[PDB]
Design a protein around this ligand. Sequence first.
Ligand SMILES: C[As](C)(=O)[O-]
Ligand SMILES: [Ca+2]
Ligand SMILES: [Zn+2]
Length: 542
Amino acid sequence: IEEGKLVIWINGDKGYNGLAEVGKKFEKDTGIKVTVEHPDKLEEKFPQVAATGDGPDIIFWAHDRFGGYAQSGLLAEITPAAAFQDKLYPFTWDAVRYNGKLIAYPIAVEALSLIYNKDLLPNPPKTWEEIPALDKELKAKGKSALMFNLQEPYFTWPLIAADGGYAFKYAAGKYDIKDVGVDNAGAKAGLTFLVDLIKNKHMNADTDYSIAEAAFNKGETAMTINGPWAWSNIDTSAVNYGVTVLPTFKGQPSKPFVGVLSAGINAASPNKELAKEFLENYLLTDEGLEAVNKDKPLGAVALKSYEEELAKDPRIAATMENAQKGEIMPNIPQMSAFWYAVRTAVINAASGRQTVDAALAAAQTNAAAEFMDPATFTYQFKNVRWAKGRRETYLCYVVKRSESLDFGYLRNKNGCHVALLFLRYISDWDLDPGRCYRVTWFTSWSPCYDCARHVADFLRGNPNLSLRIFTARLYFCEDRKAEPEGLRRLAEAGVQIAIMTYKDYEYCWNTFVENHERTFKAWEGLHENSVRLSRQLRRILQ
Ligand SMILES: C[As](C)(=O)[O-]
Ligand SMILES: [Ca+2]
Ligand SMILES: [Zn+2]
């Protein structure tokens, strides 16, 4: 990693030649060389390539990706002056805030808007409630009122959240992953309205992005819901199209997720002051943003002065308005479980498989985290030999795609063993045979014979699923030594079985436990018992 020199990473779909122009001016004035790279898949790169040797000095990406970096400690904390912060819209600073600290500079703002055909619909509706009648009217004329992608919750959330639904509760640059607004009354209302639009044949349950885009671009529908990225395509077609504020629901604005293009600084960068000088005095300026805007449109921008210039284009003003009425995309990783849950819900409610209430309840439980009591964990997962009296069995689990679809813990309930309860849970999911899933268990007890058997058969029935089991203790029922054959059966089915080591207890302590910010405290003989049990399991597995 060079010193006295700036290396900038930004995606290829951005304005990087304009950015290179900016860096050229910076190099001209300060004699400090600046090179813009736009490598393919840089956002996947950075969390690793930068975590060790070097990376870029500055990285441009949507803010939600930075949170994951920030907790890894890969992003330098910034403290720009109030005088500089006032140059940007205050809500954009909230997007670059992680755990109370500012981890990046806001650049651009994007959100969904209501795109309408001006020839079909010169006066687009202000409310969602208007849309059924309007559709009934347009369907007599061979058109439809509205088509947008219903398959992805990103597009359907603005309506669902309007009456008070939300992802995670946000305070002072911090998100509560235990607080989730998915099954609350507002979300119920919004999703009920959507499903009612489908039941009444105003919209179609199978409509997706390309279908909606094709429909609107060909003039087959009066409205669609979409972002700036779609605009040029509509430019190619012949459609007279406006872009305006999303319709209200029950008097309240639709609330789309707001992406914020942001510039983070490498925590491993020697050049941090150079980066701040560049970003503050060169990039974020009317001229600096103008430069990259010439190359490719940023959409709406975080800088007030230039946004006032860009907003003379009413579609950008619409983008900004919808953004200011929407909610900031949470930058926490648990968001991935949100996406999967809500999507599922919205599908199951749209096809009539589930009621709105049931779907949103399941989605709520999936998205919201439930943490174990610390004393409970310490007692139940102790790997020592006084292994009797732990009469229950606790199972911590993570379900992935690498995307973390679910995580949490179970315990034996009403006589039913915990492994079977998990099978019961995961069975209910509709898993795509096409896709592959990775499930990880941390169990206080190793499964008994019957549990191990049912798990083995389940995994035989689902080859797209793979399972790792990290166990604290090895369970045996008296007078059999049936259990070793069960474990052996699991290994035969392709289960990876291992005894929990210190690092596993660390992970569980900082993942599944409510620890009140206390470090994991090992007991005496943890490693000893772990090795002993490891040996023993090694004997059993042959
Ligand atoms: C060790 As058991 C009772 O969870 O199969
Ligand atoms: Ca949960
Ligand atoms: Zn069992």
